[PDB]
Design a protein around this ligand. Structure first.
Ligand SMILES: CO[C@@H]([C@H](O)CC(=O)[C@@H](C)[C@@H](O)CC[C@@H](C)[C@@H]1O[C@]2(CC[C@@H](C)[C@H](CC[C@H](C)C(C)=O)O2)CC[C@@H]1C)[C@H](OC(=O)C[C@@H](O)/C(C(=O)O)=C(\C)C(=O)O)C(C)C
Ligand SMILES: [Cl-]
Ligand SMILES: [Mn+2]
Ligand SMILES: [Mn+2]
Ligand code: NA
Length: 294
C-alpha cells in the first residue's frame, strides 16, 4: 500500500532548493510511515546489537536541510549504515520532513538503518518545544498522536560490536545490567524517573563526583569515574551519546571514554556550533564528518 520510493523521492527532490522549501506528504502517507515503522521497531530489540562500520548521528531537531547534508557527506542510505541517537523533532523548522525521511529509510532498510529514542520523542516534551504546533499547523493533532504512538515504540540503546554503548542521554544509577534495558516493555511513555528516563535525559559533567542533580529538572549528571567504572564493568570501550549542543559538533569526555555528538549546526539559529556525524570503521576506529557553522 505504501509507495516508499515515491515518498523518498519527494523528500529528496528539494535538495538544492532554497533551504526551507517544505515537502508536504499526504496525511495517509505519514500515517502509513508511522504504522509500518512502529511494527518494525517492535519487531527488533529495545537494546540494539549493531555491527560496524556505520555512521552515528546526534540531534537533528527538525533541521531538515542539514539532515540532507549529512546524507550527502556520509552517503544516502543504504550506502552507509546509520544509527541516529534521537531528537529528530522540536526546535527546528522542518521536523515533519526530518522524521518522515528517517521513518521511510527505516522501513526501506530496516536492518541497515536505526533510530533511537531521544527525550523529544515524547508527547509531553514535543507538546512544548515545537512538534505539536508544527503538526497542528501542517496536518492535524490526530496525526501528532499517530507520531506519539510510533515514538513510544522506539528502541532506547544500541551496542556496536560489544564495545560502543550508545544512547541519547546517558548513564543511569539504576543501570546495573543490560538485561534491565532488555526487560523494558513497549509501547511506553518516558517516565518521570528511573532507568528509561535517565537513558534519555542524563548528562556527563566535568565537575560532578559520582551522581549529581541535573539542571534540566529531570534525571542526573554523572562524572568521569562513573563512566570509567561502567566501561570496565561491562567490557566496553566507549559511550556514544548526544543530547547536549557542543561547539565542535562532537566532544570527548573522561579521557575519551565518552563522546557527545550533536548533528544540527547553528542550533536553533541561536548557537554557532558545528554539527558532527561520527564514522565508525570496521575496527571501531572513529572519525568525523562535520557541518561547519555558517
Ligand atoms: C535551560 O534548561 C536546559 C534546556 O535548555 C531545556 C531542557 O532541558 C528542557 C527539555 C527540560 O528542562 C524540560 C523539563 C520539563 C518539561 C519537566 O517538566 C515536568 C513537568 C511537566 C511534565 C509533563 C514533565 C514530564 C517529564 C518527563 C521526564 C517526561 C515524560 O518527559 O515533567 C517537571 C520536571 C521538568 C522541569 C539547559 O540545557 C541545555 O542548554 C542543553 C542544550 O543542548 C539544549 C537542550 O534542550 O538539550 C538547549 C539549548 C535547548 O534546546 O533548550 C541546561 C543548561 C540545563
Ligand atoms: Cl565520577
Ligand atoms: Mn535530548
Ligand atoms: Mn536535543
Ligand atoms: Na542505511
Amino acid at each position: 500500500s505504501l509507495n516508499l520510493d515515491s515518498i523518498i523521492g519527494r523528500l529528496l527532490e528539494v535538495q538544492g532548493s532554497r533551504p526551507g522549501k517544505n515537502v508536504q506528504l499526504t496525511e495517509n502517507e505519514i500515517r502509513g510511515l508511522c504504522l509500518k515503522s512502529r511494527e518494525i521497531f517492535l519487531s527488533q530489540p529495545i537494546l540494539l546489537e549493531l555491527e560496524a562500520p556505520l555512521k552515528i548521528c546526534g540531534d537533528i531537531h527538525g533541521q531538515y536541510y542539514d539532515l540532507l547534508r549529512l546524507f550527502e557527506y556520509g552517503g544516502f542510505p543504504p550506502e552507509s549504515n546509520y544509527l541516529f541517537l534521537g531528537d529528530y523533532v522540536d526546535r527546528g523548522k522542518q521536523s515533519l520532513e526530518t522524521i518522515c525521511l528517517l521513518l521511510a529509510y527505516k522501513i526501506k532498510y530496516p536492518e541497515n538503518f536505526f533510530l533511537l529514542r531521544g527525550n523529544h520523542e515524547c508527547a509531553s516534551i514535543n507538546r512544548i518545544y515545537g512538534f505539536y504546533d508544527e503538526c497542528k499547523r501542517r496536518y492535524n493533532i490526530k496525526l501528532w498522536k499517530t507520531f506519539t504512538d510510533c515514538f513510544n515504540c522506539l528502541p532506547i540503546a544500541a551496542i556496536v560490536d560489544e564495545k560502543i554503548f550508545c544512547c541519547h542521554g546517558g548513564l543511569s544509577p539504576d543501570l546495573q545490567s543490560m538485561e534491565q534495558i532488555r526487560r523494558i516493555m513497549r509501547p511506553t511513555d518516558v517516565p518521570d524517573q528511573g532507568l528509561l528516563c535517565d537513558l534519555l535525559w542524563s548528562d556527563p559533567d566535568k565537575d560532578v563526583q559520582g551522581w549529581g542533580e541535573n539542571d534540566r529538572g529531570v534525571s542526573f549528571t554523572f562524572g568521569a569515574e562513573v563512566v570509567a567504572k561502567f566501561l570496565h564493568k561491562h567490557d566496553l570501550d566507549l559511550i556514544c551519546r548526544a543530547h547536549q549542543v557542543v561547539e565542535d559538533g562532537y566532544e570527548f569526555f573522561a579521557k575519551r571514554q565518552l563522546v557527545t555528538l550533536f548533528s544540527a549546526p547553528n542550533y536553533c539559529g541561536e548557537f554557532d556550533n558545528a554539527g558532527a556525524m561520527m564514522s565508525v570503521d570496521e575496527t571501531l576506529m572513529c572519525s568525523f564528518q562535520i557541518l561547519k557553522p555558517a
